[PDB]
Ligand binder design. Structure first.
Ligand SMILES: [Cl-]
Ligand SMILES: [Cl-]
Ligand SMILES: [Cl-]
Ligand SMILES: [Cl-]
Lengths: 264, 264, 264, 262
């Protein structure tokens, strides 16, 4: 298990949820959604990290400070450039790197040296085995900076499948265990057609948790039709409870005994 | 729900298992493997159909007739040409079509009119939505012979992914529900590299069962290292009970409540 | 495990259900109730035996024969005297002994050599440790007839608690494991006040399944208000699904691991 | 729900655990056991209250140290009207001996103590009788300026012939009519007025029945325990059992209790 915010995560722990609205829409929208997700995850005993991407950076980050302060929740956001990292790491608990930047070594190194843990998204162009090199390079930067190495996660978000389609290869979730980092599944982005697919979010979420992951990322919204960003792939907030209850059941079923593939 | 052999199958029923050795190796290998699967499946309440491929056709079919006569088990085998349909159908309980022949309508029609149910394999070159037409055509032929139309299953066995690789798109398992036929997942052939992938058989089996299917196919062998065909991808017989017990748990979890994707 | 009808029962197996209307009311009431229970238990994967007590003996058994004929279900009925055994055993799949006859050794003996398995009810006057002697005697008789000994269940139905009251001692369910026979819990009669307690049927069913049993016996009816016998303690047929769903979850939870009492 | 210590309890909430060594044996025995129980319960999200019985001065001192050092709420039994003031000044929850459930001067005094009270049902009472006991405790509280929602009804067995108790699961449902959280005492419900094998059995049954709380005695080495060793659950098995109980608790509270439709 690696230490993440106030809990332990890993293939050998209960899965954690990263969830929130796609973009920081307003302050009430973010605080209300964060609070509702807290209550949902509290009842299910699912460790929960709130996400939104950044109204302006400053105001987005301020609102993220308020979720942290008001609700006591850890928060995660994406960083897009080396110059954003110092400011973002001073506010949030976990950085996340864009999938397209997974091979930009200066940028990955900079996140690695930030002093915060990093959820490293796997590019749509990588093979699952390539993620070992990504994580290893991040760990060299961390070690160079005097920081611990157990602070990265490998995040699956789909691989290119012809034009304008992604496929979620469940083998990837098993392969990336070789990174010795927690594996996270991004269920919302894995259904997106590049360049609504909501119906497939529960499908891939069930499939992934059953495969065996450390964490799950999902976007949500109270009324997704009225969402400011990527609405058609968000799970409505009033259905998150039922979905998570099913995923907890799958997670317990597959972790209660060793994974058969390990005996192969 | 569809009647298959002496049980009810479908998305709302507990999953059924199709399993056996890849090919008929020997009468004793087959009877022993079949018998030991029967005891594993009886203990878990998993409906079970024995499968092996046809030592020559006459001899392979004789031996399958013995699995039937000695053990009271339903049996399934794949049929390779129109010429063999009549003989094979007089011995087995369920026909299965090779994936490459899924668009050969004369062949599909002949299987459909055979008098036996047919597990129709989705070609590695088809899109999931294409399988509706294949099933609709099979049902035409059934109907024209006076036969019930609910005697077909849609079988996922992987889709081409670059060269020498297949990917198991879990969205396919949901999409093919539109065929109004039971969807069956072939976990063994889904991991094969076309043109040593055993470790992914349980991974995809767990993923597919969590996604929601009517049926599961897997090859097994008492000692896969000595198998006469596809040995590297066979699950060992002495690990089948453990695997099946996990799959039952998953199957129940996802079918206890409606699938969330149906709200979408 | 013990082999029962077409399945395997026991303390380590998923629980089975014995259920039906208290008495055979009519052919249509029996067939419809049997058919509804069949479909509910099929979906939940609960092995199922239909029961009703005998319109006259001849007509009662005829109708139970129709349940087998028309629905292919196994059927259980109670027998009341030695002279009725040959006829009843010629029709039904499982005999049941009335609780008050549990010490009538000639009658218990005749049932035990009938050629059919027997659910032996524990008299309201017996202590749980006394059932071992009953089962041991039944097994003597079976063995002497050249029959298998593993063909009996011990069925808990309450113990006398003062006047006009029965209590369900959950310790009995554990103690009677020493019979080396599957233990069955009669939820419907355990709530009866000798000489409407329906509300306690779910209570005691949940307690018993959580305690750990091989089987459950419950009386049901489409509309208990119009039931010809024991109507006020029957579970309505339209609530059986919901109840059984809860009970399967409890059964799995307690049988996933060893029972802690086996360490002590 | 009712507020109890820093959490909410009730038939509609996750079950809480009351547990500890039968008696206060030692400061280190008490602090170590309370610490391991805290860790086990934290891991499972089981709200936890530490119990041991008390001489009295030294017993309450050691119980104050469990609170100070581990931040846990503590419960103990009080035996007489004249112990109440001191006990309530130290502990978070009082508990009344079963035999005293109809001794109303005593029950009233506990009710006016300022603390919540787990009221044990006498082995001689019928389940319907606890309503009267709770109503009278609530009157005493109200007549003294205190909130009425501070009592729990605790099942610990009913007399069954001579030298035996039986745990009537109907009692746990019936006592919901008190509109107070129902607590099951799994340890004393097996005691013959050497029965540890029935503690898991009754705990599982009671949780599946549906209760607000569970009480169990434990010890690191029951063989070497100073009272009731033969009925203690060994500490190194409490995790396993509680894990089972949590699943049962969740499963029965996930939907409405079917008995509420009949
Ligand atoms: Cl697609
Ligand atoms: Cl690969
Ligand atoms: Cl009563
Ligand atoms: Cl006893």
């Amino acid at each position: 298990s690696m230490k993440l915010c106030d809990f332990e995560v890993g293939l050998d722990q209960p899965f954690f949820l990263i969830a929130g609205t796609c973009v920081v829409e307003s302050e009430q929208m973010t605080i209300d959604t964060a609070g509702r997700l807290k209550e949902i995850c509290e009842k299910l005993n699912v460790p929960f990290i709130y996400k939104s991407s950044y109204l302006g950076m400053d105001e987005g980050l301020r609102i993220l400070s308020e979720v942290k302060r008001q609700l006591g929740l850890p928060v995660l956001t994406d960083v897009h450039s080396i110059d954003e990292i110092e400011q973002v790491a001073s506010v949030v608990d976990v950085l996340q790197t864009p999938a397209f930047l997974c091979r930009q070594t200066d940028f990955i190194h900079a996140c690695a040296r930030s002093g915060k843990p990093v959820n490293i998204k796997k590019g749509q162009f990588l093979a699952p085995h390539d993620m070992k090199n990504v994580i290893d390079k991040a760990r060299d930067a961390a070690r160079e900076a005097g920081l611990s190495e157990d602070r990265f996660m490998a995040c699956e978000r789909g691989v290119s499948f012809g034009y304008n389609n992604l496929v979620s290869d469940m083998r990837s979730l098993a392969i990336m265990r070789e990174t010795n980092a927690p594996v996270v599944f991004d269920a919302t982005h894995s259904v997106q057609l590049p360049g609504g697919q909501r119906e497939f979010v529960p499908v891939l979420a069930r499939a992934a948790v059953a495969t065996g992951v450390a964490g799950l990322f999902m976007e949500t919204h109270p009324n997704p039709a009225e969402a400011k960003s990527d609405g058609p792939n968000a799970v409505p907030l009033n259905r998150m409870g039922a979905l998570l209850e099913t995923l907890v059941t799958l997670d317990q079923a597959v972790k209660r005994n060793p994974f058969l593939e390990n005996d192969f």
